[PDB]
Structure 1
Amino acid sequence: TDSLIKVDMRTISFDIPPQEVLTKDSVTISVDGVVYYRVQNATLAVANITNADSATRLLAQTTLRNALGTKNLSQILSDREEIAHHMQSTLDDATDDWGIKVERVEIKDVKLPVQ
């Protein structure tokens, strides 16, 4: 069926709002990020609009916190691509149930508050 309702099938992005994280070397940081994704299955995505919108954003936040909590501050700067690619794999696993491919994750800013 050539459905009348159509969905953007190309790369789009949402921001992960700043998450407060404790590094392995005990530094308190605020980290925000960007998730790049696209609908790969229009039928699954249309079926899961409510179940994916909320759940994906929260999972992006949790995925970030868990990944960064296991690293030293130094590692977060130098291993940023490894960390991001690991997050992308974790996020892409969960989003498949909702017809979404996560293509890329980027760690944006690491804020250091008054310690």
Structure 2
Amino acid sequence: MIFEKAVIVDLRTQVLDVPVQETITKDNVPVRVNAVVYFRVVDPVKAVTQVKNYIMATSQISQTTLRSVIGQAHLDELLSERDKLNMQLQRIIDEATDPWGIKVTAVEIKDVELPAGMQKAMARQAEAERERRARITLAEAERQAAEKLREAAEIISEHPMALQLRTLQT
């Protein structure tokens, strides 16, 4: 005959790969990004009944969302707030998916790829601003310490006794 995979209730998590996309961050940087969907057919009748091929349907919304999301996202959110991204991804994608009887469990972004050379520059320049921050922030702490210090030196001079009554309950 002709055989076909049975759509039965899932016991262990099924895993689907979302194909690479090219799209631009909000931010303005072109990127290629792919990711992984973890799901479990919870109601096979809906999965068979409500979409033609739920595997491909899920594959679709997955791309649409991953595209969309990156659209409204700063380069930095892809490189640095995965946890929040994937969570954002699970949320939208699980929801979309329930008409079809699929529970989406997690959706973690797999690899992110950027224009070549870019991350070297981005590495160098962040190394540079990490320092330039250390400078200013410190130079600041000090300018202020200097102020409060000069301020206590005035009070101590004008009020010789001010350090006494405080020393007198030790």
TM norm structure 1: 0.85
RMSD: 1.9
1:8-87 to 2 correspondence within 5 Å? 8-9=9-10, 10-48=12-50, 50-87=52-89
Note the C-alpha offset of 1:29. Answer: 0.5
Amino acid at match of 1:38: R
Q: Secondary structure at the match of 1:111?
A: strand
Note the C-alpha offset of 1:49. Answer: 5.9
**Structure number with higher strand proportion:** 1
Runs of 4+ in 1 over 4 A off after TM superposition: none
* Structure 1: tracts of 5 or more residues without a match: none
Note the C-alpha offset of 1:106. Answer: 0.7
Amino acid at match of 2:81: D
Q: Does the alignment pair 1:7 with 2:4?
A: no
Count of aligned pairs between the two proteins: 111
* Structure 2: tracts of 5 or more residues without a match: 1-5, 119-170
TM norm structure 2: 0.59
Residue 40 to residue 110, structure 1, CA distance change in 2 (3 Å) = same
**Structure number with higher helix proportion:** 2
Amino acid at match of 1:39: V
Note the C-alpha offset of 1:94. Answer: 1.5
Which shows bigger deviation, 16-25 or 105-114?
A: 105-114
Superposed CA offset, 1:47-76 (max 9, x none): 246242332211100100111111111121
Which residue of structure 1 aligns with residue 150 of structure 2?
A: none
CA distance in 2 between counterparts of 1:28 and 1:37 reads 29
* Contact residue 16 and residue 36 of structure 2 kept, 8 A: yes
Q: Secondary structure at the match of 2:115?
A: coil
Which residue of structure 2 aligns with residue 103 of structure 1?
A: 105
Equivalent pairs: percent with the same residue? 44
Pick the structure with greater CA Rg.
2
Note the C-alpha offset of 1:46. Answer: 3.1
